[PDB]
Design a protein around this nucleic acid. Structure first.
Lengths: 43, 171, 602, 234, 137
RNA sequence: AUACAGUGAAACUGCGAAGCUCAUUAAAUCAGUUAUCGUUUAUUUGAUAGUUACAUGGUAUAACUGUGGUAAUUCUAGAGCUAAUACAUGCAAUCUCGACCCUUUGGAAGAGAUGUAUUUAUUAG
RNA sequence: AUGGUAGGAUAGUGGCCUACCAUGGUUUCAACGGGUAACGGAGAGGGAGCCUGAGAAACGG
């Protein structure tokens, strides 16, 4: 089952580490605004 | 990138074998030709020697054989219904040998009328009930026996008898 | 066109060939759907009419497009007007193809089916009645010749289909038609139910004189023993019942034969009563022609194994015929009875002696015993009577060989082997060896002591035996070595037992009956058949049966020495080295087998 | 590879090991490299007619040499077993037969003997259009063979027409030439064929001196009946 | 027989539904030679096995070996063990060794753990299987 | 040589282009031997294809002529030629069964039959 | 990783790879791992990729 990758493996993979860096700016709308709008998502 | 060497694999006793040498082209392997329904597209690929292979990337036509009455007609392929190996090919309607497909019953229908003079002498005109139902529906089940990815052809034969019943239960 | 325009003539021939196919092809496909009434005359006048005159000679080999057109016209009632045109020229043309000497089977089959279809397809017009009469008369006159030409079983069947169609249609009403249909039928004899049904209709409806049906009666009498399935028998008995009705002489016999063969199960009280009837002077009354179906039935009952009363009575029923031969005042009328004894009973006795079943064999062994004991007019079994010593018991060998006590069987077979020299060669090969050889291959524990002495007895018997039969006896056993794995040991020992009688034949000539004067001819037979075949079997590498093939080497050292001294030097080295090649084998037990065999050889 | 050292050259050619750096490689042709004698070796080192490769080229270019009745101009043509070499200028005809030691011997033959050769039937099978044919040890494809001809039989081929004149079945008592192994070049009569299916079939052969030896079937070549060879032996 | 997603059938062997001459489906079989009797269960069996020496597209050629069955747990193949006495010249003495060979077994043969099987070499069937069972005892 | 015909630059076709320096690896290198009924194979060699034509087109250009750009290359654009084993196109026969058994090798009415390559199906083997 | 079924690709066999299924395979008769007078296999500035041809993943492009 683990063989051939049929099972997800949660170990580190070195080549993919630090391929990209997160953007610290984040979403344009503030976190509280996003939380509010999801709570009302689709009524 | 695709290679056919057995060196990369693990041993029978099981030592993780080390790379002897760089990949050679005389164990070369090529990508899967995911044949699919539609306007014919075939590519010519140069193989070892002067031999040539045809890569049916797209095909909507095939020469399918009615083995019982011993004919073979060229018919449109409707789509893939069942493939024993993997269902994703059925979902993607990938065309490969042993794939169960739906084919044109019109030429077979006309041929039957011509040769037996009966809609669909009488004893010969009699055939299996399930295939009669398939013609009445207008869609015929068939199994591909040719390899579109090597010869560039999607030939096949009409399912009948035990094979037809088995695939019907599988469907 | 003149012969000069060769190219133009060739293309015209192609157009005629292609078009004539075109007429047949279109007319096969849409023959029934389209109405041709307007074009009946135009098609007939321009196509068929120019070619009717010669049509016989062209279409002899294989079916043609024009011929295929006529056949469909014959098949389909609506299209008979083609046949009606011009005094039935096309129908006459079809008959002319049949009448031709060089007509081949491929064209007969389609015609004869077409003629049958017309007979079966009545049509309400005057032309049809004339048509069927012409077809029937031409067909019936020539049927026996066509059958001989036929080479396909289906082609036989379609013929017989037409014959039954004739009976149902009622052309057999006429005497001449009846005679011709009989002449065709006896050719078929000279599927089966259809014959019997055809015979039943022609025979039941009409009286026949005894001379006409005597030959039919004898063959159909023989069909009793050949036939085994119940449907075959009941139909066969029904014919004999009717064979009785027409001719008062046979009414008694057919009445007997019917009560001999009763069905599904046989009526045991009645058949036994019939057996009491024949034994108590009824056998005296029966005439020579009466015996036949009684005999053929008797040979069937004795062949039976399930019911004890039937085979016992049947065996004694055969014994009544032997008494009937004795009752005959002299040899002349006895000879006519003896001829049947030689033709019918003796072949079926001999195969009966080779029958596997013991209870079945014992009846035949009883049958032969009575013949040897009573030999007033049948003298072929005189040699056996010498073995019998006037039929004295414990001396006859007939009671001992099938005795309940096995030691009595074994003591008797040695005595027979000792006295083989007095016995005549043909009897030794045809009757005696068949009765004893089954002991050799018997599998039971109880019969092995009998089997070993039987091998000695057969060896002595083969010593006093004919060259031609003795050859066939050898060749059969060599075939058994290859064909039968379980009987190899029994075969090889018996072959060694048959080597020695050939041996004691060959030293004094440099004994066997009718031995050839010249030693070269027997010598060659050994050089190309016996020595090679036995040697290659000996040299085969199958360690499972290596022990079983060792006595072959004894047979090899046998067959060589009486061959010429030059031949001796040729073959012993190959034989004896093979003995050595098994001697070198590591197995101690096998090596001991080589040592003793090499000793006996020595 | 494409170059051959003299030290690596086949032993049976008889070639001296110190003559030069390199030896002739037989070209592609009827016979295998290890079982062929190139015409350069045959003509220069056995016949001594030529003194180096250049006179060999001149001779072959004069078309004075015929192999199996046809002119050869290739210096390294692979002549082999049962090959007929004709030199019309010298009126000489040779057949290549191994000696007892296992080397080609330059055996002179008469014109009639040169007219025919013998080929062991390697294969019997029908080609296209249902035409039977036989493939011999020298690669000759001969169509319409006699039905009785089977594998391991020997066919007498007429060089002029390339047709089978006669044939010999493979059977005990037949006269046989050894074409491989330690017994190479020996002649003897068959005694027995030891059949190992799925393996190498072995044949026992007895010489005129009654000595017996065993050899694989692939090294067997029927050449005639005992005491009646179809060829003049060396 | 039909325990797989695909339909199992002998390639190029046809049973005509219309003709229906015989109830039994037409079965193709061959004798492997080498004096190995083709078993009757293979002749009248209903299994489909592409690697069977009598009904599959595999030919027995080359070495013929014998061994003792050691494992029969996997599908249509087994593991056999062959032992021998190897010679050591320095001590001039023999030592026992063994080797395990995986061999294909057709369903026409019933093999347990401990019996003796004679096997025939054939083309590469799998990563490790080069042989095929041809006689059981 | 009144189509050219010897030799022949250039160009288009055809064939062939398949020593050094670093690392190191225990029967996984290598050597012997088996099988390919599980495969490809230039070339050599033996066989092997009866299914407008007194010879078609540029659907064509190189070399070549000539006009130019660029510091500039095995860098180059425009215009005008002309060919093939380069590129495309393409064309009144034979063999059987053989009545008549006419003549008795023989002619012969009539019936017929007749590429290869790929893929699938089917039959014989 | 051991094997079966089916598929993809090769010049073709084959887990070589892919979809499902069984938990298998070697080993104290030495698997696996370590050392070595095991000179007693790799690349053409460095990795990735493509093209020709019968034969090269080409000391070519």
């Amino acid at each position: 089952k683990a063989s051939k990758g049929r099972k997800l493996n949660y170990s580190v993979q070195d080549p993919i580490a630090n391929y990209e860096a997160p953007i610290t700016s984040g979403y344009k709308w503030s976190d509280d605004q996003i939380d509010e709008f999801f709570a009302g998502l689709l009524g | 990138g695709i290679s056919r060497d057995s060196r990369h694999k693990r041993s029978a006793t099981g030592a993780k074998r080390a790379q002897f040498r760089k990949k050679r082209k005389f164990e070369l392997g090529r990508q899967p030709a995911n044949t699919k329904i539609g306007a014919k597209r075939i590519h010519s690929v140069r193989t070892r020697g002067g031999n040539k292979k045809y890569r049916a990337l797209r095909i909507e036509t095939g020469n399918f054989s009615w083995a019982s009455e011993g004919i073979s007609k060229k018919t449109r392929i409707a789509g893939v219904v069942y493939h024993p190996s993997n269902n994703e090919l059925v979902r993607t309607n990938t065309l490969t040998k042993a794939a169960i497909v739906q084919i044109d019953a019109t030429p077979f229908r006309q041929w039957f009328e011509a040769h037996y003079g009966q809609t669909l002498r009488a004893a010969s005109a009699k055939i299996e009930s399930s295939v009669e139902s398939q013609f009445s529906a207008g869609r015929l089940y068939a199994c591909i026996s040719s390899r579109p990815g090597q010869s560039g052809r999607c030939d096949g034969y009409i399912l009948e008898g035990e094979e037809l019943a088995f695939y019907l239960r599988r469907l | 066109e003149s012969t000069e325009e060769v190219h133009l003539r060739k293309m015209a021939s192609n157009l005629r060939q292609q078009g004539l196919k075109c007429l047949s092809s279109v007319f096969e496909f849409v023959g029934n759907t389209f109405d041709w009434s307007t074009s009946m005359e135009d098609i007939y006048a321009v196509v068929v009419k120019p070619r009717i005159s010669h049509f016989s000679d062209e279409n002899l080999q294989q079916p043609s497009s024009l011929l295929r057109l006529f056949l469909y016209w014959a098949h389909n009632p609506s299209l008979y007007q083609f046949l009606y045109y011009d005094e039935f020229a096309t129908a006459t043309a079809l008959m002319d193809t049949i009448s031709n000497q060089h007509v081949k089977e491929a064209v007969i089959g389609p015609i004869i089916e077409a003629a049958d279809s017309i007979i079966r397809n009545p049509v309400n017009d005057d032309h049809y009645v004339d048509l069927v009469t012409l077809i029937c008369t031409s067909c019936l006159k020539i049927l026996p010749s066509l059958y001989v030409k036929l080479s396909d079983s289906n082609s036989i069947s379609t013929f017989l289909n037409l014959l039954v169609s004739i009976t149902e249609m009622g052309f057999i009403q006429d005497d001449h038609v009846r005679s011709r249909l009989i002449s065709s039928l006896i050719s078929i004899l000279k599927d089966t139910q259809k014959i019997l049904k055809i015979l039943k209709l022609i025979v039941f409806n009409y009286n026949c004189s005894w001379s006409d049906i005597e030959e039919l009666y004898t063959t159909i009498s023989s069909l009793f023993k050949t036939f085994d399935e119940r449907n075959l028998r009941v139909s066969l008995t029904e014919l004999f019942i009717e064979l009785g009705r027409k001719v008062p002489e046979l009414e008694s016999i057919s009445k007997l034969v019917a009560d001999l063969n009763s069905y599904h199960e046989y009526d045991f009280p009645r058949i036994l009563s019939t057996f009491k009837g024949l034994i108590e002077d009824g056998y005296k009354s029966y005439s020579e022609l009466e015996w036949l179906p009684l005999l053929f039935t008797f040979l069937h009952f004795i062949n039976n194994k399930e019911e004890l009363a039937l085979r016992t009575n049947a065996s004694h029923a055969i014994m009544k015929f032997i008494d009937f031969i004795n009752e005959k005042p002299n040899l002349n009328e006895a000879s006519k009875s003896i001829s049947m004894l030689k033709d019918i009973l003796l072949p079926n006795i001999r195969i009966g002696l080779r029958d596997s079943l013991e209870e079945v064999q014992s009846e035949y062994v009883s049958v032969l015993s009575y013949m040897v004991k009573n030999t007033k007019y049948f003298t072929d079994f005189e040699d056996m009577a010498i073995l019998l010593y006037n039929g004295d018991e414990e001396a006859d060998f007939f009671t001992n060989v099938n005795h309940i006590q096995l030691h009595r069987r074994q003591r008797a077979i040695k005595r027979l082997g000792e006295h083989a020299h007095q016995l005549k060669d043909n009897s030794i090969s045809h009757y005696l060896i068949p009765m004893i050889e089954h002991y050799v291959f018997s599998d039971d524990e109880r019969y092995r002591n009998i089997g070993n002495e039987t091998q000695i007895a057969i060896g002595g018997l083969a010593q006093h035996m004919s060259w031609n039969q003795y050859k066939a006896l050898l060749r059969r056993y060599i075939s058994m070595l290859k064909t039968k794995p379980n009987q190899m040991k029994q075969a090889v020992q018996l072959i060694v037992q048959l080597s020695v009688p050939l041996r004691e034949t060959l030293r004094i000539v440099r004994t066997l009956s009718k031995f050839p004067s010249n030693l070269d001819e027997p010598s060659n037979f050994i050089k190309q058949e016996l020595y090679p075949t036995l040697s290659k079997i000996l040299g085969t590498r199958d360690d499972e049966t290596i022990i079983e093939r060792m006595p072959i080497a004894e047979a090899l050292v046998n067959i060589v020495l009486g061959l010429t001294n030059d031949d001796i030097t040729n073959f012993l080295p190959s034989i004896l080295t093979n003995i050595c090649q098994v001697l070198r084998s590591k197995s101690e037990e096998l090596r001991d087998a080589v040592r003793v065999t090499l000793g006996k050889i020595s | 590879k494409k170059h051959l050292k003299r030290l690596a050259a086949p032993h049976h050619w008889l070639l001296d090991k110190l003559s030069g750096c390199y030896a002739p490689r037989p070209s592609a042709g009827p016979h295998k490299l290890r079982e062929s004698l190139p015409l350069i070796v045959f003509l220069r080192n056995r016949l001594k007619y030529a003194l180096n490769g250049r006179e060999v080229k001149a001779i072959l270019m004069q078309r004075h040499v015929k192999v199996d009745g046809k002119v050869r101009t290739d210096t390294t043509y692979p002549a082999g077993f049962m090959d007929v070499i004709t030199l019309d200028a010298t009126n000489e005809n040779f057949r290549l037969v191994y000696d007892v030691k296992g080397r080609f011997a330059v055996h002179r033959i008469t014109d009639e003997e040169a007219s025919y050769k013998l080929g062991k039937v390697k294969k019997v099978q029908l080609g296209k259009k249902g035409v039977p044919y036989v493939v011999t040890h020298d690669g000759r494809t001969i169509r319409y063979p006699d039905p009785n001809i089977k594998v391991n039989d020997t066919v007498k081929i007429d060089l002029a027409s390339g047709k089978i004149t006669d044939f010999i079945k493979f059977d005990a008592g037949k006269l046989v030439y050894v074409t491989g192994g330690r017994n190479l070049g020996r002649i003897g009569t068959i005694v027995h064929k030891e059949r190992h299916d799925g393996g190498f079939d072995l044949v026992h052969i007895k010489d005129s001196l009654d000595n017996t030896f065993v050899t694989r079937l692939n090294n067997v070549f029927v050449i005639g009946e005992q005491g009646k060879p179809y060829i003049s032996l060396p | 027989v039909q325990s797989e997603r695909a339909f199992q059938k002998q390639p190029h062997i046809f049973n005509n539904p219309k003709v229906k001459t015989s109830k039994r489906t037409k079965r193709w079989y061959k004798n492997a030679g080498l004096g190995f009797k083709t078993p009757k269960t293979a002749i009248e069996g209903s299994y489909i096995d592409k690697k069977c020496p009598f009904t599959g597209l595999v030919s027995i050629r080359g070495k013929i070996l014998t061994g003792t069955v050691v494992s029969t747990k996997m599908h249509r193949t087994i593991v056999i063990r062959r032992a021998y006495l190897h010679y050591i010249p320095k001590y001039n003495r023999y030592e026992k060794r063994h080797k395990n060979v995986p061999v294909h077994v057709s369903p026409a043969f019933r093999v347990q753990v401990g019996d003796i099987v004679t096997v025939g070499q054939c083309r590469p069937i799998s990563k490790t299987v080069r042989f095929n069972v041809v006689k059981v005892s």
